């Protein structure tokens with residue numbers, strides 16, 4: 331797919347905004363436009379840089395971050411910038427944390443599934459993301475629109491066990507990750523936070539069948555989707571197209587996802603811990619609206 335070759339001298343490197351999975355990203359100007367630039371830090375990131383460049387130049391989707399072009403001297407990517415923050419910072423970041431609703435949580439997950447289903451529908455082979463997690467997901471438009479980032483592939487908590495068992499694996503690994511993320515936005519908890527120590531400890535746990543705890547009062551239609559997504563056996567996980575369909579159906583019972591995040595929350599996570607956790611979000615309205623349709 332098309333890319334602007336860009337001359338490094340016609341862009342103005344502003345403020346660093348954060349590190350990606352690899353590289354470093356800065357706000358900047360290019361033809362007086364808001365733009366993010368990503369540059370490699372060390373030489374070990376040049377491979378990731380080429381993968382990302384090749385992969386991102388092929389994709390165009392409203393839930394995937396736009397690539398405008400590149401600069402081959404020095405090596406840098408030029409992307410869309412918008413006001414917002416990572417899903418990680420929205421969920422777990424610095425005070426003050428925003429209030430959000432069940433509708434936001436479900437919409438964020440629908441939007442990620444839409445971008446990933448596009449990736450998995452690529453011809454001749456699926457583009458597998460391989461690193462879906464909230465630090466690689468950006469919220470824009472007042473926290474209502476989700477964009478997938480970091481296509482260059484601390485990620486053990488979201489990794490399907492077949493990937494870190496070094497088996498062969500498919501696009502179903504992304505479905506496992508999406509499932510963990512669904513759990514995370516609903517509970518507002520870090521998956522496997524309690525399992526201390528280095529990463530091999532998470533790997534061991536998940537490899538042996540450990541999953542995040544069940545959620546109190548979670549509707550069965552959502553629970554069923556979530557738990558299928560994190561099936562040990564990848565063939566029992568739904569495809570992303572099926573996820574998109576199911577989440578689209580469910581959204582008719584979650585009005586208000588277009589509301590901006592505007593209110594602060596004092597989020598004290600209540601220790602549930604008897605093998606079940608409370609949702610951060612509230613499902614009473616879902617149940618009310620569902621009963622209106624289904625007796």
Ligand SMILES: CNC(=O)[C@@H](C)N(Cc1ccccc1OC(F)F)C(=O)c1cnc(C(=O)n2cc3ccc(C(N)=O)cc3c2)[nH]1
Nearest residue numbers: 347348349350355366411412414415416419466468479480
């Ligand atoms: C509260 N502060 C934050 O959450 C920081 C970490 N953040 C998001 C952000 C910045 C750099 C790298 C990663 C990142 O997290 C996530 F968005 F990928 C931003 O502030 C921010 C605001 N607007 C953006 C943005 O437009 N972009 C555009 C990006 C394009 C690609 C990548 C990437 N990692 O490949 C990050 C990008 C971040 N980022």
